[PDB]
Design a protein around this ligand. Structure first.
Ligand SMILES: c1ccc2sc(N3CCN(Cc4c[nH]c5ccccc45)CC3)nc2c1
Ligand SMILES: c1ccc2sc(N3CCN(Cc4c[nH]c5ccccc45)CC3)nc2c1
Ligand SMILES: [Zn+2]
Ligand SMILES: [Zn+2]
Ligand SMILES: [Zn+2]
Ligand SMILES: [Zn+2]
Lengths: 359, 359
């Protein structure tokens, strides 16, 4: 099975990275063990959706393209390595974002920095190593590949867009005209920047490039199939499915039980520009807006309870149903446009959409 | 002058990065201003030794190689951009290492994370952006250069070695057999790992690759002059000068006044494996070792004063003078070996050594 091959390549990449630390970096066995545990804890335990998208896109092309068996194996192995580059990039983001946000739990366990023998002093650097490993993988496994240059260039652009997205996210509750490194930042009082367009910018950059665009395009690159699809359609469909994925995440932060979510959601206390806050402000009357302003962005559980009640009473399920219906309609139109140049790729996009919509 | 051209290219690279954030990343003017201030605060104010080494190596080759004037200008501009890639890589390290170590001051001002409108939540990500900018520079300015592939591969290897070096540094006061993410780490009691070989490993990885190896080799790459020098000699001389630079830094942390140093040195309170601690343990009697163990790695200023007195009474100046004499002798031997294939490059190495030795 595809998942089995993907998971087997993790063990191979881990062994390569750790053996290289021993043969070239004078690592000792105890530090190699620490890094092995850090890699497992930070990289494993998710659903591997991003990495598996690379594998699925490559499998689709293998079914319609003439290749020797050894070439099919090479392409699948490259798709698995590429998929792990994305999972390790995600691991870097999660480690650093958990430290930045002072998060407590992730994937049902404590955040990496909270492990007793880790601490923030080590975890920041462990996060740096996770991203460095993505490059060591690429240069080693893809050394002689025709797609190495395009892959590294794409990966770097996606990583930069993601870091810019994190900046948009962490500053989304401040007034833009007050941003100033020299002055402590107050929370917005008018919430004028909680709009659909501003929310869409945050999400586009913080999530969609690395969660949807990069796995889809990497699958095309390892398949030598990019100059067969319309890139503007790939970007449009990735940014559309990516926003829906984040909207689902935002709703879950507020209403999915901590055991199912794997953490206690704190977007309200954190004053995040979430889909729920923007949608609520898009339909609230004057008294509801005033009540939201008096309670949002506060740790006090009674204030968080007022916000959750405002959301529940505003029938945000009706807005989500209308948003969902519109996304279903636009994703299906883009898949149709994708069929003009590639039915196989349009099918992988339909799979990606089905796994997102029904998660 | 060389410095003038180098500093002029900073303004050009800054404008390119910020204009790209506006034209491609939907940045707003307030966030572009925040990033401009972050870039200036974190990248400027040092001596630019690393970036200027790239420029000096390239100038040396220009003086002995036939080129059209436009080609000389292109090579110098590439050496300046490459130099800024290293200065921005250093800026990334300093931002993250100041957060990891809980440092207070850097280059005579507060550490970036301590600025009132920054905070750790933003500063970790600002540090990530600084390194992403090094890649955006390379792909933009060096898009059509023959050396792009070698330069990116070298840069990545140097960055990874540096992150591994940071891990060696932050864990240098723990016993290797006790490292365990699940268990809070006690400080060593035996100091058995405070040896010259272990100290040399820490320094080799945490400082020498990015401070000496990368600027020297990048100068060779932008000059299309690498396949003219013996790479094993370049690595040997970079690792030798780099260790001396760190030994000087270690001595300054302990004995250079806070105003000249630009910070209050805390290597003793931090229990760092410094040249001073290793050298002291290499000559101390049983009572001196016991007194060091009772006082090292503690915040108590009276305990720090006992350690500084132990160092002063141990005549570590005599050990430094012998170390220095040996480095002078070995650096001169390596420069001689470098003259076999390139007098010009051996001269740049002599300049680099003179600037390090007499800083
Ligand atoms: C899509 C978009 C918006 C929404 S709103 C939502 N709801 C389902 C659970 N309801 C009860 C509840 C569970 N936990 C709570 C905590 C506080 C207040 C109330 C509750 C609250 C509303 N479902 C969606 C789906
Ligand atoms: C190279 C290698 C080792 C050393 S040791 C050193 N010294 C110069 C200043 N001396 C006085 C001092 C200044 N500040 C202090 C604080 C506490 C105790 C004492 C002092 C202490 C010893 N110079 C070097 C140079
Ligand atoms: Zn976050
Ligand atoms: Zn969330
Ligand atoms: Zn440090
Ligand atoms: Zn120091």
């Amino acid at each position: 099975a595809s998942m089995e091959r993907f998971l087997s390549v993790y063990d191979e990449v881990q062994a390569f990275l750790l053996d290289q630390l021993q043969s070239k970096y004078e690592i000792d066995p105890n530090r190699a063990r620490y890094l092995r545990i850090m890699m497992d804890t930070t990289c494993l335990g998710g659903k591997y959706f991003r990495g598996m998208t690379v594998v699925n896109v490559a499998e689709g092309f293998l079914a319609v393209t003439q290749h020797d068996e050894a070439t099919k194996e090479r392409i699948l192995h490259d798709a698995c390595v590429g998929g792990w580059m994305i999972e390790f990039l995600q691991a870097h983001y999660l480690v650093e974002d958990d430290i930045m946000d002072g998060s407590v739990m992730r994937r049902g366990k404590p955040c990496w920095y909270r492990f007793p023998g880790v601490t923030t002093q080590c975890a920041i650097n462990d996060g740096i190593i996770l991203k460095s490993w993505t490059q060591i993988m690429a240069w080693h496994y893809f050394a002689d590949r025709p797609f190495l240059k395009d892959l590294l260039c794409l990966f770097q652009k996606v990583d930069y867009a993601t870091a810019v997205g994190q900046m948009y996210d962490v500053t989304s509750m401040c007034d833009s005209n007050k941003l100033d490194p020299e002055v402590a930042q107050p929370m917005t009082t008018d919430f004028a920047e909680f709009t659909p367009a501003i929310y869409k910018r945050i999400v586009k950059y913080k999530t969609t490039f690395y969660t949807y665009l990069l796995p889809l395009v990497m699958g095309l690159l390892v398949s030598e199939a990019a100059a067969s699809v319309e890139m503007n359609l790939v970007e449009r469909v990735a940014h559309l499915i990516g926003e829906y994925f984040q909207v689902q995440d935002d709703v879950m932060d507020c209403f999915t039980p901590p055991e199912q979510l794997g953490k206690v959601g704190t977007d309200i206390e954190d004053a995040k520009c979430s889909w729920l806050a923007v949608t609520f402000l898009g339909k609230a009357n004057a008294a509801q807006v005033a009540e939201f302003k008096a309670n949002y962005g506060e740790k006090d559980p009674a204030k968080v309870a007022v916000v959750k009640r405002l959301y529940s009473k505003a029938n945000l399920q009706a807005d989500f149903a209308a948003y969902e219906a519109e996304v279903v309609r636009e994703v299906e139109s883009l898949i149709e446009q994708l069929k003009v140049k590639s039915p196989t790729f349009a099918e992988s996009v339909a799979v990606v959409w089905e796994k997102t919509h029904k998660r």
